[PDB]
PDB file of N, CA and C in Angstrom:
ATOM      1  N   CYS G   1       3.118   4.480   6.163  1.00 36.01           N
ATOM      2  CA  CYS G   1       4.505   4.072   5.750  1.00 36.01           C
ATOM      3  C   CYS G   1       5.522   5.068   6.406  1.00 36.01           C
ATOM      4  N   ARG G   2       6.376   4.648   7.347  1.00 36.08           N
ATOM      5  CA  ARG G   2       7.288   5.449   8.099  1.00 36.08           C
ATOM      6  C   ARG G   2       8.697   4.903   8.409  1.00 36.08           C
ATOM      7  N   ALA G   3       9.073   4.997   9.655  1.00 36.89           N
ATOM      8  CA  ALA G   3      10.433   4.812  10.152  1.00 36.89           C
ATOM      9  C   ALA G   3      11.090   3.400  10.085  1.00 36.89           C
ATOM     10  N   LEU G   4      10.556   2.412  10.854  1.00 33.91           N
ATOM     11  CA  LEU G   4      10.890   0.988  10.713  1.00 33.91           C
ATOM     12  C   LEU G   4      10.377   0.311   9.361  1.00 33.91           C
ATOM     13  N   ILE G   5       9.250   0.833   8.861  1.00 33.57           N
ATOM     14  CA  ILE G   5       8.860   0.564   7.438  1.00 33.57           C
ATOM     15  C   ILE G   5      10.013   0.880   6.428  1.00 33.57           C
ATOM     16  N   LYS G   6      10.810   1.958   6.583  1.00 34.25           N
ATOM     17  CA  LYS G   6      12.060   2.180   5.864  1.00 34.25           C
ATOM     18  C   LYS G   6      13.320   1.322   6.351  1.00 34.25           C
ATOM     19  N   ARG G   7      13.393   0.913   7.654  1.00 36.62           N
ATOM     20  CA  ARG G   7      14.352  -0.308   7.996  1.00 36.62           C
ATOM     21  C   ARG G   7      14.038  -1.665   7.202  1.00 36.62           C
ATOM     22  N   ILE G   8      12.782  -2.099   7.322  1.00 37.71           N
ATOM     23  CA  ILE G   8      12.265  -3.308   6.574  1.00 37.71           C
ATOM     24  C   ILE G   8      12.446  -3.078   5.028  1.00 37.71           C
ATOM     25  N   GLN G   9      11.994  -1.936   4.437  1.00 37.61           N
ATOM     26  CA  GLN G   9      12.206  -1.655   2.947  1.00 37.61           C
ATOM     27  C   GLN G   9      13.636  -1.494   2.470  1.00 37.61           C
ATOM     28  N   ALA G  10      14.509  -0.866   3.286  1.00 35.19           N
ATOM     29  CA  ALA G  10      16.002  -1.027   3.159  1.00 35.19           C
ATOM     30  C   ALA G  10      16.466  -2.529   2.945  1.00 35.19           C
ATOM     31  N   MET G  11      15.977  -3.454   3.689  1.00 34.80           N
ATOM     32  CA  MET G  11      16.084  -4.917   3.370  1.00 34.80           C
ATOM     33  C   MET G  11      15.317  -5.488   2.158  1.00 34.80           C
ATOM     34  N   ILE G  12      13.932  -5.148   2.059  1.00 35.68           N
ATOM     35  CA  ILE G  12      12.964  -5.754   1.142  1.00 35.68           C
ATOM     36  C   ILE G  12      12.942  -5.256  -0.385  1.00 35.68           C
ATOM     37  N   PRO G  13      12.691  -3.987  -0.788  1.00 33.93           N
ATOM     38  CA  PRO G  13      12.808  -3.454  -2.221  1.00 33.93           C
ATOM     39  C   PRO G  13      13.636  -2.267  -2.532  1.00 33.93           C
ATOM     40  N   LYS G  14      14.438  -1.769  -1.540  1.00 30.25           N
ATOM     41  CA  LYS G  14      15.309  -0.525  -1.632  1.00 30.25           C
ATOM     42  C   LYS G  14      14.507   0.796  -1.841  1.00 30.25           C
ATOM     43  N   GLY G  15      13.529   1.034  -0.795  1.00 29.79           N
ATOM     44  CA  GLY G  15      12.764   2.300  -0.758  1.00 29.79           C
ATOM     45  C   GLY G  15      12.160   2.472   0.593  1.00 29.79           C
TER      46      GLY G  15
END
């Protein structure tokens, strides 16, 4: 769990 994982999670569950 890394960089674009935090781009997608910024959209998906806020983490």
